[PDB]
Amino acid sequence: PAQSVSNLYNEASGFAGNGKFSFETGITYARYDARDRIKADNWTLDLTGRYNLDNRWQFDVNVPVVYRESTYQSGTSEESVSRDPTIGDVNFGIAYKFLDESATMPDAVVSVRVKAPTGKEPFGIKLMYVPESLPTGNGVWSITPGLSMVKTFDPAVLFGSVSYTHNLEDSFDDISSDVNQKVGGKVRLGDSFQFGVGVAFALNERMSMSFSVSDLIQRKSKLKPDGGGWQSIVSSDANAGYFNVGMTIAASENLTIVPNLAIGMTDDAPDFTFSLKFPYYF
Amino acid sequence: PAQSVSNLYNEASGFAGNGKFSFETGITYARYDARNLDRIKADNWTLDLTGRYNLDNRWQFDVNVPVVYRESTYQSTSEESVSRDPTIGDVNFGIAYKFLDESATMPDAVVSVRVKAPTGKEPFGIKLVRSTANDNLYVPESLPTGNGVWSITPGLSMVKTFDPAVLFGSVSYTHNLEDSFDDISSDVNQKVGGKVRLGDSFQFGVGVAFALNERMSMSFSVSDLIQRKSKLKPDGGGWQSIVSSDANAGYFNVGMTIAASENLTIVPNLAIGMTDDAPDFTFSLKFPYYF
Amino acid sequence: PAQSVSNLYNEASGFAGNGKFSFETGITYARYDARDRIKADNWTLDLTGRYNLDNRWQFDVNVPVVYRESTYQSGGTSEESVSRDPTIGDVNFGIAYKFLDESATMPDAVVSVRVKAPTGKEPFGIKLVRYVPESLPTGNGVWSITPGLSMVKTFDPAVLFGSVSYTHNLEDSFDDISSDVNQKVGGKVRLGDSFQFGVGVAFALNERMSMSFSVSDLIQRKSKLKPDGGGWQSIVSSDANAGYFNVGMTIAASENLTIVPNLAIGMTDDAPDFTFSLKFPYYF
Ligand SMILES: CCCCCCCCCCCC[N+](C)(C)[O-]
Ligand SMILES: CCCCCCCCCCCC[N+](C)(C)[O-]
Questions:
Q1: B172-194 in b/e burial notation, b at 16+ Cβ within 10 A?
Q2: How far apart are CA C264 and CA C262, in angstroms?
Q3: Contact partners of A by the rule of 3+ C-beta pairs under 8 A?
Q4: Residue B241 needs a FRET pair 20 to 30 A away by CA distance; which of A203, B103, B129, C159 works?
Q5: Which chain C residue has the Cα nearest residue B164?
């Protein structure tokens, strides 16, 4: 099977099939904005290991490193806060390919992914103007099952995916933004679901190009301060649309370059995200 | 023959030169986010029911009924929401005439007009009810479903093949008719009758498309609609225009056409809003069944 | 050959091979809808002359003509409009040199310089009245020099391309650097410098037509003022980030004439919401 074809499937399905072991290195820049104003610049380095078994099972571990740099403007006045390279919410996932593509069926793949609360929690960080530090994960355990369907209708390859996320309830020693007090509390982050569709083409032996779209929807998040009852956090629910354009480029027989632009379609998504990924196959 | 070519043309022109009678079902989602009041989020679902009759690749007649479902959140801090369970929208109908057949030097041209009737729930006389939590947060008592008036919209389409790429374009404009109402205030304490005149508007856009294979097509296109501002005239006052009622709504579109079985087509389309007067995005799926 | 390939290269690289003299007329419409709401509609007619010397050197001069309409609404609602009838902008000119020719392993490489004179109406003199300006500028008021670089390369049927440049602005000075009607302050200005890059991909659809997808960013550093008083100062929100996503075509109308439609979608708040353009290079 051509090289371009193998890589279109790997990018689309999340399943690195032709091969056994792989280490992926990702670099990603994203950019946010607002009215006061508020610029932000996020760099993330992804490190990923993957073990693929017979092209039927797959296991992966993932470690993000996060450098961040924000600006809060309000007055005449402008002020920065930043965050030198730290982890990261660490996560692993398992995947099973249950249908292999035939003339009637597609390539179907079910998966699970568990994310641990290893980064710097937002809750308990203190403060017009301005935070003491920037977080690097959400502070909670989460578990996300999902599904990928992929199929070739020569020369198109259509693909899609759906997934939902459950966050587990968790408690914090401090829950207050106010520098003076220290209140502790429980948190139920709202569940969420995600989906996307797209089309791709093998342009030649080594290159492929992809168009796609996805939307993420985040249910409302509730809080329990010590003493009081439950209550929902206003403005906490979200809708983050993305339109994506992408390529795939075979460098060696084992190296691939994967560039991707992702244009935020709503306010809840960053303005744009350029990304760059380098899977290596031993 | 075609049949991706044929599907592609029906989409680009708005003219099913193919068969005779057909019936299109459409579902469409659209997200809004805006910014007294601080932000207003909105989820809009629409089911379209459309019947059309094509005649000899020369005339076409069409009827459309939208069913509308909307949900809207009003933030100030605190927050409240409001709904509209499936009611009908502005029913409308359309005539079109193919005045140029495509050739080695001329395109497919199609002149047409579309008339729209105020069957939906209008926005005039819907009251702002202050809650009940934020104390200077005003929230509408119900949500509208059409714009309360009649309108006529003539328009034109041009389509030409330059193998393998099919260019296309279109222009139209909407004249709205003046109407009167028992109540046009949104104050719960007062009732003020009046007449209203919505701003007329014009739309245009261009695109390209391709037959990827015997059964699929893909397209890219762009558009802009521009709207003159609207006016109200209480009794017995004079016409006053309303600031911010003017608009410019630009859209960028990716779409496909997929032939499921000769009778059925599936037509997915993403429209990305480029301006604040357009919704942020709009997915849609349409299912023309050909009898 | 083909013409589709040639037109496509001229568009990615900014460098017309395959001709001697040429004249380009371009028309651009841009839409701003910002934050108080400053809504604005700009058109620009661009007139450009071009001389390529043996597919090696090239000299261009460009004259922009600029029409504007802005509209400001109350806040600290009622609208008020301002406009600026056709008026010459920031005349510029550039030289270019192709240092690598495309082979089985080499890209097509062009190095270049663009010099921009301050021939348009400067922003600094202009006065606020009431809270709205009594006119609109047509350029930025300073000299600037801009070296650039570009690469293009076929990997059949894909043509990959990319480019990068920076702009250095030259410190200047003005009789009036204020906008308060009741005050006339002299001073000296350093417009912040900037770094532009973008990348992209393009395909020949047939012997006449090409299609293009690309993206680019512009990063601008902060501007500074020195009043007569008086030492240097940062203007607080003068820095910028303007990102863009582009879809385009080239159509071969005839042997001499290409039509170039381009849509550019603003992705950040420091960019027009959108921009349409048509260009008509004519090759004598
Ligand atoms: C970034 C917004 C959320 C995108 C949602 C995409 C669905 C995730 C499905 C998991 C399967 C893996 N893969 C690569 C197809 O995404
Ligand atoms: C400012 C430069 C403008 C270009 C000058 C106009 C030249 C007119 C000649 C038109 C050519 C017609 N033709 C090819 C049939 O000869």
A1: bebebeebebeebbbeeeeebbb
A2: 7
A3: B, C
A4: B129
A5: C205
